[PDB]
Structure 1
Amino acid sequence: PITGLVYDQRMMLHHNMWDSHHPELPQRISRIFSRHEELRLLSRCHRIPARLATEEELALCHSSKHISIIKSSEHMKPRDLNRLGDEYNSIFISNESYTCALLAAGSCFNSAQAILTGQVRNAVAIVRPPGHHAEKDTACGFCFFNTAALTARYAQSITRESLRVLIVDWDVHHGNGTQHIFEEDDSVLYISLHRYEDGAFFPNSEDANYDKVGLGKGRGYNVNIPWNGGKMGDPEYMAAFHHLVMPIAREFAPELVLVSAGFDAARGDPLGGFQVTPEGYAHLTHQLMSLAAGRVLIILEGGYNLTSISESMSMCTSMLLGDSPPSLTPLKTSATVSINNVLRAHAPFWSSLR
């Protein structure tokens, strides 16, 4: 009946030397950590130490070439960091980036280990840079290595290959890297909710549409819930959880739940354009706690309004600690259309949807 928390100020060292106001700020993690202190949540958690991921652990999901290229940035001059970062879609690199990415992943491995060895019931990881856009062979969208995907494979490496891991990705963006890593895998159920706008929203691929249901033995094990038609908020997220996320998750019966917990769908986020409230995130967390005997690890992804992310992630930790959920309209038409499209796509695979 204990909640773990991992945070290490060393992850602040990754920075954008050309644009100090770039939204993926060092202060994202320190602001969230400070809010946990202010709300007296930190003293209620068991502190789990950060560690570096090893290169062998990175190789659970990533190619040796990709690992070595990112590692090579540790001693690069500015011009070379710029050139390397520009090889990718939406990446900046500093000499500290590789270490920080290692720390984000190893923090999550230690948290998964703490849950699976029974030291804690659940945990929260206040980490950066984020992970879910990183692919086997490339960095993308602020992400170097796919922390959540690696954590699922790490968990399987200390239990069994077929350990059932649910990844719920509520960052406003599609976790293209996570989808691809697990596309043929029935051991890892990936469920993403994301703004899509028929491909107009980053990362601008039809891979994020509802008809991408998985491949081969993984068919049915990839659930994309794509939003179209502008601002969505608590009503739409609650409805998606009620009709899709929770029924599928219960049927899958995960043994571990990882949350790719971006807070860029939050009210106030300049990039997401959505209105999910801190109370909304608390309710989503509380629902997920009903799965996997409560074995839930919340991993920070995106989220760029410092006040919004600090309040939102803190509310999630309050839920993990067992606090009562806070008090919480009809859906937008396009949201009903999205949910129905996903229901039709997934009813062949999940009896709970029929």
Structure 2
Amino acid sequence: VYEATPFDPITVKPSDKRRVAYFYDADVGNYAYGAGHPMKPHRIRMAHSLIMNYGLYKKMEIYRAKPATKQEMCQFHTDEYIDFLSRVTPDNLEMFKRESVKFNVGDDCPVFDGLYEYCSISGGGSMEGAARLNRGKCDVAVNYAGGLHHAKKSEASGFCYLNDIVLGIIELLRYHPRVLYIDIDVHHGDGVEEAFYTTDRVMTCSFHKYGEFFPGTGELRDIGVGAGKNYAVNVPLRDGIDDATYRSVFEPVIKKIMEWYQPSAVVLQCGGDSLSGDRLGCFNLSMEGHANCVNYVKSFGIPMMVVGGGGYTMRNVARTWCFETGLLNNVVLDKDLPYNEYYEYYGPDYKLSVRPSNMFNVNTPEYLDKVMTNIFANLENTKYA
């Protein structure tokens, strides 16, 4: 069903108007990771500056969500896991030589310190965003601090120590009947999918690279078991996918999902490792090729939340999230960056544009045709909600 088509530039929809809410805790960036490893909250400060210097704060309300307590964290995790996280620190690691192995919290993804603090900040941000979405206060919640899909129930893998996506999704599911999670991060969000594998009130759609690639999960046959059959949509791609290919895959699949499943609330994970030049992600998307997905989801006009995610090169993810918050305010930003504290990050062009590489797009139209045919055949069964 794949059809290669050119990429029309992004445009702001005239009638689709909405007030958004930008959750930012002034301390999110203060905690560095151990030694230059890929994540750092720092890329949430930088983005913020741009959103401030563009005069976007006059287009929305900026909030500060009070941090999540252990009682709210445990709505997904287990107590022993949360207690261990609450008391661990680089000083008292040798005291927990067994726990660090059972919970995998002291391995390749090690604990800096402020760990519990930063996790609580992200969780509270996501949960208050979901709550304000529920209370009819706004239509969009923007939190570039959450988006930790990789954390399991009693162990953290791949840096997502607290899986705040699931806490926020439950907070949403305290009112809303059907929630649609749209993952456009290059990786597979195995945490969320595993945590909603057997339910029909949550439909996940993960556009991820498949192959011998972390987390090694997310085939086309992973379609959910039990009552959750046909309610998990994995789209496994290959390297080098580009703006026109990604658009021609995303638009029809998402339109079909929104046409048959018909969610009442959307959670969009706008991770930044699916961009060209990122430290790990092996895609070749452009900034506008990424923001087109958010524009298309917003075109539907239902309650929607925008969460952060990966992103291991701070400059591209900062510029991307700035353009995303701009597009979410119905304003196409000028590509000349105003003066900010982190001006000298974005050399040497000092422009808002992210530039794709000439990486070879390996997704042949026959493969994507077969994939989207399989996916539409699966979605045939979700017509009756």
Q: TM-score range by the shorter chain?
A: 0.7 to 0.9
Pick closer, same or farther for the CA change 1:43–1:90 going to 2, 3 Å.
Answer: farther
- 1:312 & 1:193 partners in 2: Cα distance? 18
Partner of 2:214: 202
Identity of aligned residues (%): 24
Residues 211, 342 of structure 1: 8 Å contact kept? no
Partner of 1:344: 374
2:25 is the counterpart of 1:15:
no
Q: Which amino acid aligns with 2:222?
A: K
Partner of 1:104: 122
Count residues in correspondence. 341
- Residue 79 of structure 1 deviates from its aligned partner by 5.1
- TM-score normalised over the length of structure 2: 0.81
Pick closer, same or farther for the CA change 1:339–1:146 going to 2, 3 Å.
Answer: farther
- Residue 115 of structure 1 deviates from its aligned partner by 1.7
Partner of 2:342: none
- Residue 211 of structure 1 deviates from its aligned partner by 0.7
Unaligned runs of 5+ in 2: 1-17, 336-352
From 226, 234, 256, the equivalent of 1:216 is 226
SS in 2 for 1:347: helix
Residues 38, 279 of structure 2: 8 Å contact kept? no
Q: Which amino acid aligns with 2:321?
A: M
RMSD (CA atoms): 2.8
- 1:155 & 1:309 partners in 2: Cα distance? 26
* Greater than 3 Å deviation, 4+ residue runs: 74-86, 324-336
Pick closer, same or farther for the CA change 1:218–1:22 going to 2, 3 Å.
Answer: same
2:176 is the counterpart of 1:168:
no
Residues 89, 111 of structure 2: 8 Å contact kept? no
- Higher percent of residues as helix: 1
Residues 232, 274 of structure 1: 8 Å contact kept? yes
Q: Is 218-227 or 31-40 further displaced after alignment?
A: 31-40
2:83 is the counterpart of 1:68:
yes
2:139 is the counterpart of 1:121:
yes
Deviations 1:238-281 (A, max 9, x none): 12212312211332111111112211011220200222111112
- Residue 76 of structure 1 deviates from its aligned partner by 4.3
- Residue 66 of structure 1 deviates from its aligned partner by 1.8
- Residue 175 of structure 1 deviates from its aligned partner by 0.3
Q: Is 241-250 or 264-273 further displaced after alignment?
A: 241-250
Deviations 1:210-245 (A, max 9, x none): 1101111111111111112x2112123212212312
Structure with bigger gyration radius: 2
Residues 151, 157 of structure 2: 8 Å contact kept? yes
Residues 60, 154 of structure 1: 8 Å contact kept? no
Residues 48, 110 of structure 1: 8 Å contact kept? no
- TM-score normalised over the length of structure 1: 0.87
- 2:255 & 2:96 partners in 1: Cα distance? 43
Partner of 1:3: 20
Unaligned runs of 5+ in 1: none
Q: Is 74-83 or 106-115 further displaced after alignment?
A: 74-83
